[PDB]
Amino acid sequence: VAQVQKQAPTFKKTAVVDGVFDEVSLDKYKGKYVVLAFIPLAFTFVSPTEIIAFSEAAKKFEEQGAQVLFASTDSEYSLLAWTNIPRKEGGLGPINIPLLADTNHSLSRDYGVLIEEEGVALRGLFIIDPKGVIRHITINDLPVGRNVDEALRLVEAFQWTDKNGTVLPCNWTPGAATIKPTVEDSKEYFEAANK
Amino acid sequence: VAQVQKQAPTFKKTAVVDGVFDEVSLDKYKGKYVVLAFIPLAFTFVSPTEIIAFSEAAKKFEEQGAQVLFASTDSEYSLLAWTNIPRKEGGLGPINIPLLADTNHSLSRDYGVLIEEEGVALRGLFIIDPKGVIRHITINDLPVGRNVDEALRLVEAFQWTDKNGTVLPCNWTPGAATIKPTVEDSKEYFEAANK
Amino acid sequence: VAQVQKQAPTFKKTAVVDGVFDEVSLDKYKGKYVVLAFIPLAFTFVSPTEIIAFSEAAKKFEEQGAQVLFASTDSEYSLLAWTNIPRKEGGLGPINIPLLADTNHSLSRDYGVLIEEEGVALRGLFIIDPKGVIRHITINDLPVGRNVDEALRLVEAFQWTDKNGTVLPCNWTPGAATIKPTVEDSKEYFEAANK
Amino acid sequence: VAQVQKQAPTFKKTAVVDGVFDEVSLDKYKGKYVVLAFIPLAFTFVSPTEIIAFSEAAKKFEEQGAQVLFASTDSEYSLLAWTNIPRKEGGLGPINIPLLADTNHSLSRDYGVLIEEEGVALRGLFIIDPKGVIRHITINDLPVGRNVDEALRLVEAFQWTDKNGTVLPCNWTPGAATIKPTVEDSKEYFEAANK
């Protein structure tokens, strides 16, 4: 499966990019950070809200050197169709993020988010670094959408730790106190953090 | 093998509770959500902040029907000793959440967060409901603290969905619009939200 | 796998039936012939032309003790969506036949029509008798549609055969000749057919 | 283990080609679509209507660059013997199409049409293209014969789609409306087909 600290399972999927079919793979986005977010089913409820909120935030992630991909078990024909139904009617409308079509279930299987019985993916989201390792997993059960901002926090967070060697405290958003993870230089932080 | 919508690997761990040793285990919190967050290692850096920020926020979880257990591969003795070290010097000082000693690693193993070669757990956090099913999994690679508000949010979220049978869109917080997951009742939300 | 002369893999699948979801299964059509027809993809090209044709034909299968089921690897949400598109735009309109979501592949797999690497069923068509026995299989490669009248013809051929224990020459259509299948009795037919 | 989209099983069988024995293999009809049609038994009842029917249509099939091959698990001599009986009395008389002796059941086994229990092949028909890919399988249970016209229709179909790259709607015969298999271009078909 996909595991934090391990290489992200490799894939080439047909995807709806800018309203046309184009193959996508981690390579397509060297060496951006990749946010691969699975939804269970096109034409449903929680899912569109997520696709939308990430799409609306597509640029915020580009700013962070991140490319967010959405993955579904539906076909590209189904994903596409969904972008052709406007958002007022639960459609996705126009979308700035790729909808990857995981019709053969390999993505959802490899990413350990396939509910075999149902043949759909859990609300798994995966943050993958330019070295293609998985730095974060979020998996949600079906009824509750993930957090666009958390997703972003984490892209930012991991990008920081990658650039600075510094380690990031719980809730750190960029600008908050970061730690130096030696026993010595980490006093800087704890001394400063606790009045 | 701790996986969303399966039953949380069950357990019984010696833990540090209000400063003394105590057996902890899912059913010790019969009826409540539990937020089980592993941290790599006591006496480190991100981990204190996690424990603290979650300890400081204990009441808030407790107000949402959630109990929060933290966990490491350290013995309860190490953990207890960390508790006896002031936060100004990277200890935890007094805290309000149980610190489970996963000294034999079952807990980390069973939760799929154990870094075998390191013998510590990734920053895994699992929101386990009353019927004991895992409902959310966050796994952050080592260098990035997780985020208390999101753990809380998710708790509230699953609590909402468990209760109202309604589903909760991306970025939901109390009072944000919810959706009735049926083709014809969900239209309410979509018209209303225009997305 | 699904096999002629052998019992048809039973299923219980969720289906768009008359614009709402419904579980269909073989036994739901007690005493009826079911013709089960798989399709590669919703929102594509020959598939709808097949669904439409068979849907339009339904009554002619009704009069023949048969019930048509289409199935595909698509979710019932897609299928349903599909249904809500005008045929002019590649949709199926309203539709007189159930569409089985086989969103976990079980049905395509069990019927031996699943294309592993793709996740879609070949154009498989199974005529299953009221005894649950697969009396005929048709499988087309993807780019070529099936033949309503021949599905129909075959059902008739089997209804006829089951009821009369005569055997049906190449190309029989109701009212065409017929061979009582014994060395002594077939002469009857072979002598009328030649000279 | 003969599946649509895969390499029809190779074989080399003694056959009756024009009153004499002769090896035949897929390969003897390089370039031709082959339609390999199994019957259960020589000397029976619907079996000889299928051979006879296809034998009249040989010229028609030849004209579509198809070679028609019939197979059963009778010995070459039994098939030849069958050829030497006038059709008036259950016979085949002279025929135009080869009759493959599958005396050892390797063909019938290999094509998934052999009733192990009975040593006779089901009424399987395989349309194999010049690439040796199986394009369509018809399997009929014993008591109903196939349709010569549909073997033609589908030869003509797969030939068409190979040459033209347009996919073929349900019931398509040559001259019928085709579809250009892309989202944007299939609208051509859908607008015209739904006046």
Place this chain on the structure above:
Amino acid sequence: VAQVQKQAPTFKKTAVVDGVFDEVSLDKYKGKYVVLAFIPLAFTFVSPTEIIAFSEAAKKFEEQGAQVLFASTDSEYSLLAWTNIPRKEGGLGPINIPLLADTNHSLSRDYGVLIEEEGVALRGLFIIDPKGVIRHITINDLPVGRNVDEALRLVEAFQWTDKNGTVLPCNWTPGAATIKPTVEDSKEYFEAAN
């Protein structure tokens, strides 16, 4: 598979009996020795001569309490069809002995005579006793037909030793010298034969 002194593989087989499909087992001829004879295939060359020969001798085998049975892997239709062609034409004409269709090859396999790759039996003849036990086996390659008389001899030979409990010299025929199979009594035979 079938070995001498072991139980004969039992079977139920559609067969052409009296020109009409009958179901045929060893049971069918309880108490009868049976001569089960496998031929490669219908509409060929040695084979008709064999079944014809046997058909001809049927009553001679009946007289020795033996049922003759033929089997090939050809279907019953094919076998029946074979009976419909005159013998001058390589057909069988009427025959007095049943024709087991081993279309699924079980018989031929079970009996150790199936050429797996050809789907056809070697020329295997088997003499099976009432108790069910294979007592003789002949397997002829395809190119050479068997020996009716020889099968008769053997049926007669065991039909004897079954009842007279004595023992049949090489080339024995009804009325030739037998051997009392003990060290004491055999000396009779050996002395008289030399």
Place this chain on the structure above:
Amino acid sequence: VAQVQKQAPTFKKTAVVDGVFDEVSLDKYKGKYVVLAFIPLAFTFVSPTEIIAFSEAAKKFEEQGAQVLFASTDSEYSLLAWTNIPRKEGGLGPINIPLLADTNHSLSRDYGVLIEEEGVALRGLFIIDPKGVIRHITINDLPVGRNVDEALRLVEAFQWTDKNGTVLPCNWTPGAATIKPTVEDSKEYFEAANK
């Protein structure tokens, strides 16, 4: 084991060959037909008669190009000392046939005539052509002896076919009607054979 049209199992066996011991193998007669004949036991009853019969017949076999060989599980010494015993007393007297000691049971076992529970070979007789190929098997249960004539027939029988590529009818002796194994030329036989 050993089977008709499979190679004969090779061997070197010590044997009595005109009184002295001799190492005897299949290739000791390269180009000749071999008639391996298995008797149960030395100093028994049927078994000497067979040997004695085949001994006087050795002349005939040499003529039709055959080496006749006899074998038992009995030792070189038991066999040798069986031939020191005059035929008047259950012995063999001097003989022309090699007597093959299969003390270790490998001949009998390899030839499928070893009755394991008893350590004795059944009345097995294999005819092997010069290409090392079992042409004929006769296996006789113990109480009845074989047929020197029939052994001879079957040698003359196979020598012919080997030589003339014609196939011998039931009961064929030399200069009896023979057969051209073709659907055409075989008719010259069936005509001459029936009226």
Place this chain on the structure above:
Amino acid sequence: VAQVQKQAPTFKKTAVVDGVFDEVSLDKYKGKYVVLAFIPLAFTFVSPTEIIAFSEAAKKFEEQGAQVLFASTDSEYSLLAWTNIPRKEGGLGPINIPLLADTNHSLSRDYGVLIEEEGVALRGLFIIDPKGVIRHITINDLPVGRNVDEALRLVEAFQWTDKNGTVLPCNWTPGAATIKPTVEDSKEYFEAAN
């Protein structure tokens, strides 16, 4: 296979006993020591001497409560035959010890004396308890007969052992000094033997 201190592999083997056939079996001599002795071949050279030497001593074993059996992969027939040949020739003429026909090789196999490749029995000999327990094994390569006297000695030794529960020194024979097998009692022996 067979091992000292372990139960003797049992058997039912047809034998030549007083010139006729009988079944022989360890418990047929219940209460007797059984010296079972294997010889590679009938109509060879060392085997008869061993058989004769042992037959001639049959009486001597009888007196020590031991039954002597011989065996071989030859049939009861080859044996019987070998029995009908003057020793002059030889042997074995008439003998007083059963000859066991290990025609199927089971005995030899079980007793570990069977030369698989030959397959005859090595000159194994086994002295067996009235309790069915192997107490002695000698095995000789094919070219050297055994030693009847030694066999007798051994039978007597273990008859004594069993009876008395003292232990027998090297070369012991009936009458020879014996050992009491405890640290303290054995002194009297060693002291006396030097």
Place this chain on the structure above:
Amino acid sequence: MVAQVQKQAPTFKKTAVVDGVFDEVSLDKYKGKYVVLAFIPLAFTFVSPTEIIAFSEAAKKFEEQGAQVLFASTDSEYSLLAWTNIPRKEGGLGPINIPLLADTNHSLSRDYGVLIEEEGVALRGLFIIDPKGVIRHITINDLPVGRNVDEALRLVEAFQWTDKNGTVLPCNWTPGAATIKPTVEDSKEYFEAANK
């Protein structure tokens, strides 16, 4: 598996007491000689002393027949040595003329097939092994009965004869007694001569 006649005797390298001194012993220490390898159950017991002492008395006689007697038990070299250091009057061995092979780790005994596993001692197994390293004779006596020096001797001389002369020994053959020309024809020379 184990030692069998006609089959090559399992090699061994074992520390042993030779002339009251530790030395390594192996079959090919006596390259050329027949080796008579004899197992005993236990140092300091009752039958064993005798057997060892016996073969040790007659060690020269075995040397004289191209043979080196070996004794082996599962005792250590120190037990065996210590045994040679208790006078025979008291239940001891030594001094002795034969080597005593310490099978401390049981490999010799289990290889020769004579180890009572539950007991960790060897059965009175004695092996006759030719200069080609082949087992020619096996004797296994249960514990309570000692073996026969003379029989061991006899059998050694028997196999020296046939190794050399190609003839075969009858039952009871002692050097000087009648051999047999091992052939159906030259055989009868012996059978006739042996009989009335």
Place this chain on the structure above:
Amino acid sequence: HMVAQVQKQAPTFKKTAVVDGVFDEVSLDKYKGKYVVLAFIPLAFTFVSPTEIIAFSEAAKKFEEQGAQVLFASTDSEYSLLAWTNIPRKEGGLGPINIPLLADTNHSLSRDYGVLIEEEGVALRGLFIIDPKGVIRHITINDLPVGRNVDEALRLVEAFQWTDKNGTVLPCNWTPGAATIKPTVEDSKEYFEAANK
């Protein structure tokens, strides 16, 4: 398969032993209610082993007083052991001895206690302290050329006796009368505040 391990039941045996100049069967059972100090030596008739056996035999009364039985075991037969016994110490003999000698002729003791050099068929200098519940509380394994320590074995017996009885926990180097620790975080501090000025 699985050897003796501290905090597991010492593998049971029943072994012929030399007990007071005569042969006797010995098991853990024979010592119901006693700590057993089971100690293996490689070989009767050697150099370090007798020193250890004599050392421990001299000390048996001191072990008996601590509620311990000492056993020795080797891979030698009971006949060599007894025979070793019957030799004076003056010449590397064991002399009369107060602790049983266990004959592990068939090696199961050695095997089960995982102290058996298989290539060699002798046991290592393994000493096992077994409590009355039958639990191995201590293992010492010395390589062959160094002998062990009666005092230590005795000390350890006393340590475990102490522990079982008192529920306190024993510092490095503790002998009866030395400071103990009560094994709780708050109560341990008693011991730590005292042992450090």
Place this chain on the structure above:
Amino acid sequence: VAQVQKQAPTFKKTAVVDGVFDEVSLDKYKGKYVVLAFIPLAFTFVSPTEIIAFSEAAKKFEEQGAQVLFASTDSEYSLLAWTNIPRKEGGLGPINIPLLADTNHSLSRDYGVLIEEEGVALRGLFIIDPKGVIRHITINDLPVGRNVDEALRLVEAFQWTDKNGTVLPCNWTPGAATIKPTVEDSKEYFEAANK
């Protein structure tokens, strides 16, 4: 595992060496005898007393050419933290011996002193020679500390036998008598040791 007179399982483990972390391995002390002593837990009771004891003895272990290494299953951070706690308060204070962190349990597992169920090591201590061979193992159950003077006793002892090929009686200390391990020479010792 790790057995006497076999090679000590090798390791590379992080260790607290004088306040800072360091990689420790056997071959870091090429030449020295290694006393590798496992403890069960940092922050407990017997364990410090042993480390503290061996720490004070450090120099006399080096004087005998040995290096003492302590190891537990705690992290480098626990160990060090313990080093920061004054000995008065249950801590370890400044120390002279390395503290190996066996967080992945491999060392413990390898030396066979890991109580799996607990994830802590028994008080195993190993004396490993400059050749890497374990010469002595002591394993104490948890409730009872080890003897520092005995550890030294035994470095010395082997340091002695290694150097001198003499052999050391029970309770040997430096300067006590020594046995020459040969039947003849040992007589000296025994003669000198008994009346």
